[PDB]
Amino acid sequence: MSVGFIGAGQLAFALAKGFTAAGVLAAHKIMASSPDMDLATVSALRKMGVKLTPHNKETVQHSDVLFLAVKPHIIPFILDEIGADIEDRHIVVSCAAGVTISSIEKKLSAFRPAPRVIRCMTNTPVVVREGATVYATGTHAQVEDGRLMEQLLSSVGFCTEVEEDLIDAVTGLSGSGPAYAFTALDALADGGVKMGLPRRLAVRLGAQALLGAAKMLLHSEQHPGQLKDNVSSPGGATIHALHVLESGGFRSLLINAVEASCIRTRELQSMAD
Amino acid sequence: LYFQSMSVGFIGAGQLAFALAKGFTAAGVLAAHKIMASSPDMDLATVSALRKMGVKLTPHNKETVQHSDVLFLAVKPHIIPFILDEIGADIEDRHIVVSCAAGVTISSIEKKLSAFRPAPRVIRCMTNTPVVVREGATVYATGTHAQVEDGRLMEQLLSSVGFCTEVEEDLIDAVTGLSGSGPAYAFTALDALADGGVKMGLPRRLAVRLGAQALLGAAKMLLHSEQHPGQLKDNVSSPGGATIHALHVLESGGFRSLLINAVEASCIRTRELQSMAD
Amino acid sequence: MSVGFIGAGQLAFALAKGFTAAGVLAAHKIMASSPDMDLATVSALRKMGVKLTPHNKETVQHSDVLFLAVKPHIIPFILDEIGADIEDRHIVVSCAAGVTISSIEKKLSAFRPAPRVIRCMTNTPVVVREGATVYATGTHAQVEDGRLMEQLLSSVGFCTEVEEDLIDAVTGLSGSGPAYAFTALDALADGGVKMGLPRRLAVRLGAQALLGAAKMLLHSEQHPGQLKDNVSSPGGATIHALHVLESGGFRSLLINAVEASCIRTRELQSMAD
Amino acid sequence: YFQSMSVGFIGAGQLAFALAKGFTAAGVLAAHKIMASSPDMDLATVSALRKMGVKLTPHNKETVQHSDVLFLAVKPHIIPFILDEIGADIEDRHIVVSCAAGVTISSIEKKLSAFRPAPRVIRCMTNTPVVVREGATVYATGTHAQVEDGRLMEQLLSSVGFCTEVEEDLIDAVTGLSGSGPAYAFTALDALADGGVKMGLPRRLAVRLGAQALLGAAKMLLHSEQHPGQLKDNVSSPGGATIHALHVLESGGFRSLLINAVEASCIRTRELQSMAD
Amino acid sequence: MSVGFIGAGQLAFALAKGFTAAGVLAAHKIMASSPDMDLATVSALRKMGVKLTPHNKETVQHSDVLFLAVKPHIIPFILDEIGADIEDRHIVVSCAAGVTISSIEKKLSAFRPAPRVIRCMTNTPVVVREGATVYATGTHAQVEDGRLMEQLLSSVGFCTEVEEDLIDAVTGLSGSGPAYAFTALDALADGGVKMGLPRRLAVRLGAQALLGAAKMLLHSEQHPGQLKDNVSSPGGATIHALHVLESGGFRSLLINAVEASCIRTRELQSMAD
Ligand SMILES: O=S(=O)(O)N1CCCC1
Ligand SMILES: O=S(=O)(O)N1CCCC1
Ligand SMILES: O=S(=O)(O)N1CCCC1
Ligand SMILES: O=S(=O)(O)N1CCCC1
Ligand SMILES: O=S(=O)(O)N1CCCC1
Secondary structure (H helix, E strand, O other): OOEEEEOOOHHHHHHHHHHHHOOOOOHHHEEEEOOOOOOHHHHHHHHHOOEEEOOHHHHHHHOOEEEEOOOHHHHHHHHHHHHHHOOOOOEEEEOOOOOOHHHHHHHHHOOOOOOEEEEEEOOHHHHHOOEEEEEEEOOOOOHHHHHHHHHHHHOOEEEEEOOHHHHHHHHHHHHOHHHHHHHHHHHHHHHHHHOOOOHHHHHHHHHHHHHHHHHHHHOOOOOHHHHHHHHOOOOOHHHHHHHHHHHOOHHHHHHHHHHHHHHHHHHOOOOOO | OOOOOOOEEEEOOOHHHHHHHHHHHHHOOOOHHHEEEEOOOOOOHHHHHHHHHOOEEEOOHHHHHHHOOEEEEOOOHHHHHHHHHHHHHHOOOOOEEEEOOOOOOHHHHHHHHHOOOOOOEEEEEEOOHHHHHOOEEEEEEEOOOOOOOHHHHHHHHHHOOEEEEEOOHHHHHHHHHHHHOHHHHHHHHHHHHHHHHHHOOOOHHHHHHHHHHHHHHHHHHHHHOOOOHHHHHHHHOOOOOHHHHHHHHHHHOOHHHHHHHHHHHHHHHHHHOOOOOO | OOEEEEOOOHHHHHHHHHHHHOOOOOHHHEEEEOOOOOOHHHHHHHHHOOEEEOOHHHHHHHOOEEEEOOOHHHHHHHHHHHHHHOOOOOEEEEOOOOOOHHHHHHHHHOOOOOOEEEEEEOOHHHHHOOEEEEEEEOOOOOHHHHHHHHHHHHOOEEEEEOOHHHHHHHHHHHHOHHHHHHHHHHHHHHHHHHOOOOHHHHHHHHHHHHHHHHHHHHOOOOOHHHHHHHHOOOOOHHHHHHHHHHHOOHHHHHHHHHHHHHHHHHHOOOOOO | OOOOOOEEEEOOOHHHHHHHHHHHHHOOOOHHHEEEEOOOOOOHHHHHHHHHOOEEEOOHHHHHHHOOEEEEOOOHHHHHHHHHHHHHHOOOOOEEEEOOOOOOHHHHHHHHHOOOOOOEEEEEEOOHHHHHOOEEEEEEEOOOOOHHHHHHHHHHHHOOEEEEEOOHHHHHHHHHHHHOHHHHHHHHHHHHHHHHHHOOOOHHHHHHHHHHHHHHHHHHHHOOOOOHHHHHHHHOOOOOHHHHHHHHHHHOOHHHHHHHHHHHHHHHHHHOOOOOO | OOEEEEOOOHHHHHHHHHHHHHOOOOHHHEEEEOOOOOOOHHHHHHHHOOEEEOOHHHHHHHOOEEEEOOOHHHHHHHHHHHHHHOOOOOEEEEOOOOOOHHHHHHHHHOOOOOOEEEEEEOOHHHHHOOEEEEEEEOOOOOHHHHHHHHHHHHOOEEEEEOOHHHHHHHHHHHHOHHHHHHHHHHHHHHHHHHOOOOHHHHHHHHHHHHHHHHHHHHHOOOOHHHHHHHHOOOOOHHHHHHHHHHHOOHHHHHHHHHHHHHHHHHHOOOOOO
16 A cells, blocks of 8 residues: 655654554655755655655655645645646545645545545654544545544554544644643653752653553543542642642643644634635 | 945934944945935934944935935834835835835835836845844845845845844744844843842842853854753753752743743734735 | 863863863863763763863873862862872862852861862853853962963853852852753744744744844943833834733743842852851 | 913813912913813812912803913813814914813814814823922924914923923823823822831831932932933842842832833723714 | 041942032032942042042041941941041941941940941932931930931931931831832833833833822822822723722832831841940
């Protein structure tokens, strides 16, 4: 099977690296196009063995599954450029935040009537095969197209089908989520440094603490509040630290973040639906 | 490189015109007598210093246009449309019109000027006052009829007084909020840092000097590093030490968020200052 | 003249790089010792041509001016280790935050009666020859020792003599200052990114804005408030941004920072004075 | 250079009293050359104008016929009723000086022009400290103001404080700054005195000291070429009492509160436009 | 009558300029001594007619009334230098914040038994003859010494005698007060500029408003709240602005400042009482 990437940014590189590391795709069965070849992301894809071309048309010809890993305001230009080159065999997978299936189908249908479109929202940890991906199938997607998508994206993390009207909220949670985690880990490490740890050890310990806690929850049937209860001895250090988190409205800030990212994602709609 | 020895004009003789004229003459790319500036108010302290520099001053904007090859519009954004009606008939094929006003779009300038002569050569720029010490930060966008080398000429000129690069025009309002207003954020921070030094027992003059030197060296380190500012921050803070204690109290006040708020507020206000039909 | 460094951390590397780049010292006339040779700072000093040794005693023998660029709680151990090896020719320059001249002289005087001690507070931008350094001369420092120190440290930035009781406050201002600036620049760049700039351009513009503003003030006789007034047109973008800084108590946060760093520096005193 | 000049106030409230008191104390106007009208002859301001020697009448018409310079010292929403009432009585000799916040020259000229075509209108924003001849006044001249009209206005208002001409579009902002400014200062002085009392001072002494401090600082700045931040720097010894107190002001966002105040007063003034311009 | 200043900083200049502008002292009857008069005051005092000497003892020998205008921690050093040079004719006027009469008398009495001491708290607006001064008379001050002090300091502003235990509070109110006013004027001008005024005009209007309001209160019998009530029309601009001041706790910030300055002044007591 042939996979192509339009756009060679962080997400394109991350998926290719994840895909090849899973053994589900040979790097040569992958082609990627970028309008900017000076990107650092484009340098590393060459070392992988991924074919690179400056013309999106060449990507479309080599590819069967076609990932649109470009910015939301760029999608309509890409669709206008290659819409004439879409064939029956193509599955077009848009990774752009906010951009609706119906808006993509509308553009592509001016060229050929039944484009097979899938919309997805993934995140950068696909690069270490621990991404979180959702997808929704378009009007003309065959039932096997969604199955194919799920099998491919399951190789690099969690993947599940959702109704399209959930994807803006997913973007605010697992799409933007890694950034919330990177911010938290920087701050936790500053906290470790303030109390006397070397920075390198503090980063390692904080990241290991977050990874292990996340894995515990994924492998548990218990509520996060129950796992929280299990950490804190009465009168102990942990419950004292939880109090100061609570006094600052820590929970409210993370709710605010998911909401703000979701609301901004809805504003990012560019084309007519 | 490009041989200049051209005439530059400033419509407006305020802080920006003085800062650019001072920077340009200090760089040696322009002689002061090849510069002409016009102001509706000849009593400005910036006007007196331009006179002593040897810059030619005139109350008549038309005379600046007739003198100039490169014409900087260094007036307030709402003043731009009056200037354009006033001198539009005087724009010749030789002119490059460089608007420095915050918010004012190229298309709004081209529309007004096209009513007189069809293909005005227009450049939009956003620079800042540190051009006066040749460490400005300048971006520019070229208009519809800007000729092949107009952008190259603009970049060569503005690079003599600091950083300069071409951008898409739709980035300029955000640049305005960051490096246009930026020096004011820094001056506020330096006043406050000196107040802190004085609180802890330093003489005011020493505290101002140390704080400014700290900001300058840190900024230079980052411009000369390939590392993330967070990594440079990490390299500086020993475990349990004075710096990480100070960083905590900055974080508790939402220091980072205040600077984000400032860039956003300046960018948003700049959009509002759109004074013409773009 | 011979210079040596006890400790091969960030500050040792920064001074050596600054010194050699100024042409005031050949890299071979410099020797540095580290208890941890696996430090990244130690790797680069080798490429410079600076002599490295694992034994502080060897540094003392090669050196005339001796920089103590180790952590405050480490100074007393270093002094106990090499105090017997101090000679009449040595000028001992302590860079450690908080550690008093009298405490260093007391330790060294148990070995030989008139140690020539200088205390200094510098910062990492000496690495690009724009440091801010102050120093105070000890009881037995000759008048030419301070002059020598000032000439050496002026090659890598601003340098001036202060009374020792100002150095804790200097530490809170120009010692910790660069970190305040790195934090501000990260945030300013986040602000530029929020409003649509690429991150690389936003970092460059923010850093250039801060450098130029700093240089303007250093080259001006005017008050920072006057230079601030000159930036803001009435009703304009800048004055709107200054208002939101003021509403958050921006000035108070920077005062808080200088104070907190100064107060913590006084707590870092380790030895008996 | 006008001792023949008659001045009228439509409105006999705080502002009319303050200006009449200041003018008469300045010696530029004899109190008998001043007439004031009010729909309420019971105000304490009316009873004080009477003992000052000002002529008082309930008829705005009579004030108009008495006056050469006519101050409109009524609330903004009252201006249109005044203008309809006395518009037909405006003569060529009249200079109509509106003091109401927010009310535009063009709105006033539009009303008066329905009667006689070229009314001479000046808009000003002053403040109550004219009553001790330390007011802060700006003015803008209307379409048909003669060039001597602005010079005359500035000569008259300079006798009771600072006075300068501005473009009209600055007057709403001036209103938020020097118009409302005295009230900010009275609030600050009450609070400073509470602080002095908290720390052990008698109330009367604390008020005197705080008011003298503010007066002297303001005069220092007015007589200095230096930035207010520079004078601040000159006051604060390192480690001293003043810089400690400045820190606690900064921690509460003191500067931002005063910016908020000028902004809020200016914005409200723009909402008080009553007439169509 | 001869007047001397030990110290040539901001306060000594301001009193000397005010005294000479008052015409109550011939400038040639004024001498001032400083070890480091590098402020422009050296050429300003000379043009003013003030005699300048580097030796504090020369000032003592010239002067009848001797103003100590040095920092509180410098006072005990001055008293030890000039103590043997105090004569019966001298009135010693300390302007230092926090330093008590009893601590000055104890110091000087080691030299001669009945030093005539006055403690003063004034402020910089004496330079425009609108200062605010309080003074307390010491144990051996003659009854005419206080009268002399009040006649002198009344020429440059308000002056009244207080009990000494009120002077710390006066320091927090009228001593520090001018700085509160300068901060307020800078911010008010920033407000004016935000709403469209040129900076120079905004500064002038704000300062004039402050000056006029203060003069109204000084010349009124009415409470400041009553003067506030007289300025605010119902529903008007001023009452809207007062609301936003109240919402930020504006009154409490000024109480906090007087308190903080007073408390810090009590900490500045340098000598033993
Ligand atoms: O004191 S506890 O909160 O029980 N504890 C649990 C993990 C580390 C500290
Ligand atoms: O609108 S301004 O505040 O005058 N301006 C100055 C620099 C960038 C924006
Ligand atoms: O104690 S530290 O925070 O490592 N230090 C480094 C520079 C000034 C203070
Ligand atoms: O201690 S100071 O802050 O320098 N001082 C100045 C006048 C009142 C108190
Ligand atoms: O509308 S008011 O609040 O009464 N007014 C008084 C002078 C400035 C504005």
